[PDB]
């Protein structure tokens, strides 16, 4: 069906870290708020460095910290400001960072 | 205004070799549930316990750890219902990162 009903009283399902800090590609969380969306608040990861932290605790510029982006669904109020009717909308969220070897190629 | 039941139009409006190039690489595993929307969820599983160093070897002094995110899914309620759901909060692995291990002698 096009329209379905959804009970917003969330049940947790098997939901029972300092990774953001201990990582060689550490990140911080930034609050993204949208009153026309459910969830209204989304926390996005922003990599602290361009390079990665090495064994000596220094930034290695030969490696890159890259955000891992995921495609997430959100509920957008439709019509706008509606408390009880929504449309699914696909957005991209940064969920953390990883350390990668850079893509290399000569200028054409 | 916070109603218990709301209406949702499922016609979505839209608004990557990391898994291999990473020092904490991972593979994707397909999790399928016909009682859930989205029915298919791809989860990351770290390939190694350690991390890949400059020389392409596994460094056992570092750990590959999965990054777990809390996500919401729709579970059919009552079961098998094509048009009614309850929001459910689950934990998914979305990739891996390389961390310096947490060390401690225990009592
Ligand atoms: O949960 C949030 N949104 C939910 C959502 O997107 N669920 C998803 N499930 C699997 C997905 C695809 N993916 C992502 C990646 C990994 F699962 F690993 F993430 N692998 C995958 O296969 S997307 C919506 C909430 C509204 C709804 F109507 F209930 C439908 C689902 C949301 F908006 C925000 C959460 C970040 C705080």
From Swiss-Prot, chain B:
- Glycosylated residues: list them: 20
**The record's account of how the chain is modified after translation:** N-glycosylated. Found both in glycosylated and nonglycosylated forms.
- Indicate yes or no for the key word Secreted: yes
The entry's localization annotation reads: Secreted
Q: Name one GO cellular component term.
A: external side of plasma membrane
Keyword Secreted annotated: yes
Between which residues do disulfide bridges form? Answer: 46-96, 51-98
**Family recorded in the similarity comment:** Belongs to the IL-17 family.
What is the protein name for this chain? Answer: Interleukin-17A
Q: Which organism is it from?
A: Homo sapiens
In the UniProt record, what gene is named as encoding this protein? IL17A
């Amino acid at each position: 069906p096009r329209t379905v009903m959804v009970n917003l009283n969330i049940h947790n399902r098997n939901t029972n870290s300092d990774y953001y800090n201990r990582s060689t590609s550490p990140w911080n969380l930034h609050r993204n708020e949208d009153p026309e969306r459910y969830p209204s608040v989304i926390w996005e990861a922003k990599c602290r460095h361009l390079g990665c932290i090495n064994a000596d605790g220094n930034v290695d510029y030969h490696m890159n910290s890259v955000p891992i982006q995921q495609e997430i669904l959100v509920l957008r109020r439709e019509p706008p400001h509606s408390p009880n009717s929504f449309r699914l909308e696909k957005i991209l969220v940064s969920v953390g960072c990883t350390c990668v070897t850079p893509i290399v190629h000569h200028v054409a």
